[PDB]
mmCIF file of C-alpha atoms in Angstrom:
data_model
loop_
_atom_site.group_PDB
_atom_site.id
_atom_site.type_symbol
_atom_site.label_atom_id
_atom_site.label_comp_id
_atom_site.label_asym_id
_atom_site.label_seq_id
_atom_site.Cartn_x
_atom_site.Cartn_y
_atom_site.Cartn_z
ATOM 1 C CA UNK H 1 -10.548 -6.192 -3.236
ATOM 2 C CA UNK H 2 -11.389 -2.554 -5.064
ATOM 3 C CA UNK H 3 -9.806 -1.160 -2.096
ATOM 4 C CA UNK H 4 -6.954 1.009 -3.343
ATOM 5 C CA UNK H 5 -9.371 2.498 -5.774
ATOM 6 C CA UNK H 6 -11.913 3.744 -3.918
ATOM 7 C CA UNK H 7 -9.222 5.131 -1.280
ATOM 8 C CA UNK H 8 -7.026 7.207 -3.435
ATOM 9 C CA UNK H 9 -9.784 10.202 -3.327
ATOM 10 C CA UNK H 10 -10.121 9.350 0.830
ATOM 11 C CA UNK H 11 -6.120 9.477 0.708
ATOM 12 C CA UNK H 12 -6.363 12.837 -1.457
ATOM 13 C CA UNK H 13 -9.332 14.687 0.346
ATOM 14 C CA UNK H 14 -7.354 13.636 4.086
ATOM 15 C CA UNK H 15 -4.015 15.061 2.861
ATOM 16 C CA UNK H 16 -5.606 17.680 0.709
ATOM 17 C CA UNK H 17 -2.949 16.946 -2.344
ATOM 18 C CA UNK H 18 -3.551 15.839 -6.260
ATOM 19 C CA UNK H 19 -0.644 13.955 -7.261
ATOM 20 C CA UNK H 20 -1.001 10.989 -4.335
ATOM 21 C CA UNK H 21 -1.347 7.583 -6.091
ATOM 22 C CA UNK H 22 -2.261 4.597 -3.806
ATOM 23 C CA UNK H 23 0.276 1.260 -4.555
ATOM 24 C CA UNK H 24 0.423 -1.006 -1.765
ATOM 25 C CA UNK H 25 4.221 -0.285 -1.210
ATOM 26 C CA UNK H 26 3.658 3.694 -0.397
ATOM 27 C CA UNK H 27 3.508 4.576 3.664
ATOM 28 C CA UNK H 28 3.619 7.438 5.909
ATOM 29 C CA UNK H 29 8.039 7.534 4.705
ATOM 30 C CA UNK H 30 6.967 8.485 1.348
ATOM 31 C CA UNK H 31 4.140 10.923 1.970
ATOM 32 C CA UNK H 32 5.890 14.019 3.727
ATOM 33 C CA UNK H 33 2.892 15.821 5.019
ATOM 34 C CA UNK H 34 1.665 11.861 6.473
ATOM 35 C CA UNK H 35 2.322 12.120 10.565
ATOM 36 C CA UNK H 36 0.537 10.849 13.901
ATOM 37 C CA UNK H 37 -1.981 13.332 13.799
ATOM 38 C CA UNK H 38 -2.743 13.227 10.093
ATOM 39 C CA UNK H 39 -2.772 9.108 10.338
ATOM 40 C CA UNK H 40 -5.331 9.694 13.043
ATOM 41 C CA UNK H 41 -6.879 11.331 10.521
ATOM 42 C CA UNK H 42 -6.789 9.315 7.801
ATOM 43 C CA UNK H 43 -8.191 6.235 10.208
ATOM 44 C CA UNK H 44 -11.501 8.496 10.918
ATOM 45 C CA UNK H 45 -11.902 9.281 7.380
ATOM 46 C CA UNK H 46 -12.338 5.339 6.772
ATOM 47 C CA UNK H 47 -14.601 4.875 10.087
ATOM 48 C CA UNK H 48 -16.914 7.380 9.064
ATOM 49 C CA UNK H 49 -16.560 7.315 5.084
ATOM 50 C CA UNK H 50 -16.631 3.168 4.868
ATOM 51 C CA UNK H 51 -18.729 2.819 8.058
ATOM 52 C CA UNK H 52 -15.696 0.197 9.250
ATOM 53 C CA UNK H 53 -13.742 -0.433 12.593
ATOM 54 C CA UNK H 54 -10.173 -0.426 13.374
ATOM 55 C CA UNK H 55 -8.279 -1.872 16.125
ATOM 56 C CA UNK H 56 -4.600 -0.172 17.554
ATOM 57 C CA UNK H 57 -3.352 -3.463 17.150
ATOM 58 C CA UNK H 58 -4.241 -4.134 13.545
ATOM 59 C CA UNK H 59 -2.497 -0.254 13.304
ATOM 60 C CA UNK H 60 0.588 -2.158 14.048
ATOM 61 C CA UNK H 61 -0.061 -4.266 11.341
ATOM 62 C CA UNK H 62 -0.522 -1.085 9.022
ATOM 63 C CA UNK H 63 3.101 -0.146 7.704
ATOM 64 C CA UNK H 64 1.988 0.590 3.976
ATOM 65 C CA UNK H 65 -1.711 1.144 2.348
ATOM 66 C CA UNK H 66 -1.145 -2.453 0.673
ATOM 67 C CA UNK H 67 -1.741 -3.264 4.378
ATOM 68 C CA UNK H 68 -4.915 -0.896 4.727
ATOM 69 C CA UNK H 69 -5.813 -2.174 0.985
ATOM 70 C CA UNK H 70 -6.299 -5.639 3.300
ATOM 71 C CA UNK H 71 -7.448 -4.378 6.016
ATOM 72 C CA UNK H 72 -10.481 -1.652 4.500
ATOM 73 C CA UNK H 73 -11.715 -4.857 2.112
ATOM 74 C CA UNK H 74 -11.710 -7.066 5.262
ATOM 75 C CA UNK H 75 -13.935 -4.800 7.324
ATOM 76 C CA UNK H 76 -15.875 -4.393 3.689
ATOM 77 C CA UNK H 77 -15.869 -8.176 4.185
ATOM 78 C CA UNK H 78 -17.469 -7.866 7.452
ATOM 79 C CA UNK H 79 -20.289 -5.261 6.152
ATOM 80 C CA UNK H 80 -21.322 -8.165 3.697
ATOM 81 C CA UNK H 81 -21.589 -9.948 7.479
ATOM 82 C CA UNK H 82 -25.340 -8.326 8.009
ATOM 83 C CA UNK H 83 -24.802 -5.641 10.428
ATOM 84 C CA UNK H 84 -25.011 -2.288 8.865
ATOM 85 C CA UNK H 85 -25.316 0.903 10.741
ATOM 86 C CA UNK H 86 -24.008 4.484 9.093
ATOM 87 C CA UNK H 87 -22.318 7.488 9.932
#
């Protein structure tokens, strides 16, 4: 899992900011500028960027980026699952 690595510049280019640093504990509470529209945003970033797929109802699994840190690596872990197709 190399996950919260390689999202800290995705994190960074979506909020357009320098000083965000991805831990698994920070969320939307500690990132004022982080709301609906910008998590909607964030969420397409990752879809087009990582070519990977997520579900509403793994969103409400998705308090923290610890729990997008899982989530990103798992859909990772289904691109090693032959069926690649970009964006």
């Amino acid at each position: 899992m190399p996950t919260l690595d390689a999202l800290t510049p995705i994190f960074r280019q979506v909020f357009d900011d320098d000083s965000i640093v991805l831990t698994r504990e920070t969320s939307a509470n500690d990132i004022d500028a982080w709301d609906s529209l910008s998590h909607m945003n964030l969420i397409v970033s990752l879809e087009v960027h990582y070519k990977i797929k997520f579900a509403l109802g793994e969103l409400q699994k998705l308090k923290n980026v610890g729990d997008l840190a899982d989530l990103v690596d798992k859909k990772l872990a289904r691109k090693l699952e032959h069926h690649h197709h970009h964006h």
